[PDB]
Design a protein around this ligand. Structure first.
Ligand SMILES: Cc1cc2nc3c(=O)[nH]c(=O)nc-3n(C[C@H](O)[C@H](O)[C@H](O)COP(=O)(O)OP(=O)(O)OC[C@H]3O[C@@H](n4cnc5c(N)ncnc54)[C@H](O)[C@@H]3O)c2cc1C
Ligand SMILES: Cc1cc2nc3c(=O)[nH]c(=O)nc-3n(C[C@H](O)[C@H](O)[C@H](O)COP(=O)(O)OP(=O)(O)OC[C@H]3O[C@@H](n4cnc5c(N)ncnc54)[C@H](O)[C@@H]3O)c2cc1C
Ligand SMILES: NC(=O)c1ccc[n+]([C@@H]2O[C@H](COP(=O)([O-])OP(=O)(O)OC[C@H]3O[C@@H](n4cnc5c(N)ncnc54)[C@H](O)[C@@H]3O)[C@@H](O)[C@H]2O)c1
Ligand SMILES: NC(=O)c1ccc[n+]([C@@H]2O[C@H](COP(=O)([O-])OP(=O)(O)OC[C@H]3O[C@@H](n4cnc5c(N)ncnc54)[C@H](O)[C@@H]3O)[C@@H](O)[C@H]2O)c1
Lengths: 278, 271
């Protein structure tokens, strides 16, 4: 009936302290659904792990190159290559290497990810492992993997609409989806947005769980979000990593920009960071 | 005698970030400001929200909810004392300066956590008082950021895309949301490839700016009065205001682009 997805691995990263939370419920739902379709599922429950989110010298267990002028980016890359990274970092890196699908489950906090997840990015997404300056965006190491955000908010969807007090949600997601995930190569799927979960009745919450589960059955066949391909740009320091001139000329006449970040002073394509286009 | 709080998020005293903090403190003191600091790494500050932040009796320990529990604790005064000490510095401060390196297109984890544990409901925001009506409307804030990448990379045509979009969640979502008037950010691009003689010039320029910082015009955000501030209306833009804007070519701000063009450098330069 569905002899598929049998070879495939999934990592679920959760950033909530309480097992009584709807965030925890969504993580359980995701794991169940994926297992049922024959995925292997690994988890990182950052609060349960008591994960340490602060970068420091202690992340390098070997010999620093220049302890007088300590620079986390350079020192962390050397340590990755020589294998004297702190073992909590390495364990997470091995889960990522193995995973084909990565799901991030968290509550929106101050228009962003929780501190503990931010720190996970900071300590685990090391140079050479997750990105290089030669291989950015679509050429990056994780180009064979897919990622998706599943977010809960306290505020209602109207508040994050084009005319809402808080403003467009597409703008809020951009730094995360483009700046962190796509930067390392991930194909980014449509975010799962659960608005105003605190004022949602029980019957509706169950529908949401059921809908999440249903989505996950075919998650791998979805079309990803649109980001400008790197090939539109001159990727060297002399050109300034600017958009190629021929591409500027092709776009001179169009009404819409390419993406939220590449709006080009024009209109932002509707729901660029929320819905795929095919 | 006005008061200033400088929040720093860098671990190394050898860093240009540390240099900029020292420069800021010197300049402000010279002009007769009182200067308080939060060096988050030096303080070994704890950035993770937990039950431990409430020292008293939880309202509902079976179904723990940080937003509700933190607000009760603020009102009854059983917040963890590390949180309270920071809150007292904020209350006193007229000017707040945030000094940090851009990390993953955002603030460092340790500063994010500072926001999460210190900007508690009732203290920093309510629901009645959002944005320009918020508790900190009498105070001014400014970001001072360093990046490794060059400014061309964050231009309209750069690989990384518009810097105005990157700053919006911080300046609007965190700072303006609580009432702060937000001043033009101090952006130091490609600090890694800047020599010592140039860095000292930059420090000197930072210092020069700070002598008149209080007289500057703040960034533009859509006033709250353009909106229907109740749950039934959905906090949407009022109909009359939608009609007045229907024909204009530019939107109001980065977040309130309204499907039109974003006013140039909305989050970087004042009017
Ligand atoms: C520091 C901070 C910053 C914040 N910033 C923002 C912000 O910028 N924007 C914003 O919109 N919000 C913000 N919030 C609010 C926050 O995003 C919400 O509290 C969060 O999304 C709630 O998710 P939860 O899983 O914790 O819900 P809970 O309140 O724990 O759960 C919601 C409801 O679902 C019920 N439930 C749990 N499990 C199940 C189940 N299996 N089946 C059915 N019902 C179930 C619960 O019992 C409860 O009734 C912020 C909160 C904090 C603490
Ligand atoms: C996890 C992580 C994520 C990152 N993500 C991004 C990203 O998304 N985008 C981005 O653009 N960058 C990113 N970076 C890079 C980061 O922003 C830069 O490395 C940072 O801005 C460097 O600033 P610094 O103060 O540490 O100075 P450094 O350049 O690291 O070192 C300071 C130098 O200044 C010198 N100096 C100090 N004081 C003085 C003085 N008074 N006079 C003269 N010289 C002085 C010191 O001697 C030293 O040589 C990231 C880095 C990390 C670790
Ligand atoms: N933008 C931000 O930075 C930010 C940060 C935090 C929260 N928020 C806001 O959080 C809201 C989500 O709803 P909420 O978390 O405020 O819900 P809430 O806590 O106000 O839920 C209210 C319900 O809980 C009941 N209740 C009983 N005792 C209570 C108590 N001690 N405290 C609170 N409620 C009690 C009320 O009677 C009512 O039924 C959104 O409006 C969102 O904007 C925004
Ligand atoms: N996260 C990011 O966005 C990002 C991206 C790329 C690189 N980085 C980091 O920062 C570094 C990027 O380099 P950078 O931007 O600091 O400097 P750079 O290496 O690009 O400096 C350019 C060099 O050419 C010269 N030069 C600079 N501008 C010029 C111009 N307009 N015309 C002619 N010559 C010019 C300079 O004197 C310098 O020697 C990388 O080494 C990496 O560590 C971060």
């Amino acid at each position: 009936a569905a002899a598929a997805m049998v070879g495939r691995r999934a990592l679920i990263v959760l950033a909530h302290s309480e097992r009584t939370s709807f965030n925890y419920a969504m993580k359980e739902a995701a794991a169940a659904a994926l297992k049922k379709k024959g995925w292997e599922v690994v988890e990182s429950d950052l609060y349960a792990m008591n994960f340490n989110p602060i970068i420091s010298r202690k992340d390098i267990t070997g010999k620093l190159k220049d302890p007088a002028n300590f620079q986390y980016p350079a020192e962390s890359v050397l340590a990755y290559k020589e294998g004297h990274l702190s073992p909590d970092i390495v364990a997470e890196q091995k889960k990522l290497e193995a995973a084909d699908l990565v799901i991030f489950q968290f509550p929106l906090q101050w228009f962003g990810v929780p501190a503990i997840l931010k720190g996970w990015f900071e300590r685990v997404f090391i140079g050479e492992f997750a990105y290089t300056y030669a291989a950015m965006y679509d050429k990056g190491p994780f180009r064979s993997k897919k990622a998706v955000l599943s977010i809960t908010t306290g505020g209602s969807g109207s508040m994050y609409s084009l005319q809402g007090i808080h403003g467009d949600m597409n703008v809020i997601l951009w730094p995360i989806q483009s700046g962190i995930l796509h930067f390392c190569g991930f194909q980014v799927l449509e975010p799962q947005l659960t608005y105003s979960i605190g004022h949602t009745p029980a019957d509706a919450r169950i529908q949401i769980l059921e809908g999440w589960k249903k989505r996950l059955e075919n998650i791998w066949d979805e079309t990803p979000l649109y980001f400008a391909p790197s090939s539109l740009f001159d990727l060297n320091f002399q050109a300034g990593f600017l958009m190629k001139k021929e591409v500027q000329d092709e776009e001179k006449n169009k009404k819409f920009g390419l993406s939220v970040g590449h709006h080009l002073g024009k209109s932002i394509p509707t729901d660029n960071q929320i819905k795929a286009r095919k």
